[PDB]
Amino acid sequence: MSHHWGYGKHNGPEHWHKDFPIAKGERQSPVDIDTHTAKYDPSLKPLSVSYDQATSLRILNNGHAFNVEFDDSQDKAVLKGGPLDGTYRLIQFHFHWGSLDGQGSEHTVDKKKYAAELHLVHWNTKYGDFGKAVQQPDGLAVLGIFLKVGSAKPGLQKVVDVLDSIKTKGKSADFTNFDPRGLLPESLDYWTYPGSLTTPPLLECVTWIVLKEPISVSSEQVLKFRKLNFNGEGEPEELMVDNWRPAQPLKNRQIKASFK
């Protein structure tokens, strides 16, 4: 039901729903947006992004995606807007990329749909424990930045350069002195909705902040993301693409967008 295609089991995993008792509730997908099904929220205090002090450490490929870890022993990469439930520091981020240039980003706004997206994960520091944040509806906060193909993104070059060295899962690479400022789009608009299974356990600990301004990346850049593998080294070649699940009906998604 409601699953003609699912990332995992071809027509949607049944065992998943029966393995997680919490399936008693309603949530599968992180978000699903419609211009009509989205409610604007007042010009409350914007999201203060302070990651000029962000210190990247390492980049790692773990089968389903490739993550770059930042240090948060101090308030290096900080994100907090007005009324919220904590300060969410940046710990890592990864990119989404669909096999076809007209899919992959997810978070489809009525008719939207992009080939790629940048997903930055922030963790609520006031509980001093990432797993504790996972056990909280507001425990995490993530930034979703759509990627559109066209003009090249000079700031993206850094990660594109190292993609070939993180091709297969299991291997790691040093990735220090990275600045996320080079990833900034033009307009800073966003949607804000708590997301589901965007985490190991089937729960809604994530707060999705999806930017309405997609960044411009070039074909040469996006093509190199398609060079990554799900497999490890010395394993049957598979291309790290899509890695996303179809969006869900009003059966537990209603969108809000807090901006002037």
Q: Which is nearer to Zn ion, 154 or 201 (CB)?
A: 201
Binding residues: 94, 96, 119, 198-199
Cβ–Cβ < 8 Å for 186, 145? no
Instruction: Candidates 54-62, 117-125, 147-155, 222-230: pick the segment binding Zn ion (CB under 5 A).
Output: 117-125
Residue nearest to Zn ion (CB): 119
**Binding of Zn ion by 119 (CB under 5 A):** yes
What's the Cα-to-Cα distance from 143 to each of 19, 112, 162, 207, 237, rounded to whole Å?
29, 17, 22, 9, 30
**Binding of Zn ion by 107 (CB under 5 A):** no
Catalytic center residues: 64
Instruction: Candidates 69-77, 80-88, 112-120, 229-237: pick the segment binding Zn ion (CB under 5 A).
Output: 112-120
What's the Cα-to-Cα distance from 165 to each of 20, 96, 109, 229, 242, rounded to whole Å?
36, 18, 34, 11, 20
Q: Which is nearer to Zn ion, 119 or 148 (CB)?
A: 119
Coil/strand/helix, residue 160: helix
**In the complex, least distance from residue 173 CB atom to Zn ion, rounded to whole angstroms:** 19
**Binding of Zn ion by 89 (CB under 5 A):** no
Distance CA 240, CA 66 (A): 9
**In the complex, least distance from residue 29 CB atom to Zn ion, rounded to whole angstroms:** 12
Q: Which is nearer to Zn ion, 119 or 169 (CB)?
A: 119
Q: Which two tokens stand for residue 173?
A: 């690479």
What's the Cα-to-Cα distance from 166 to each of 40, 69, 95, 243, rounded to whole Å?
40, 14, 13, 17
Q: Which is nearer to Zn ion, 49 or 116 (CB)?
A: 116
Residues lying near Zn ion in the complex (CB under 5 A) are found at 119
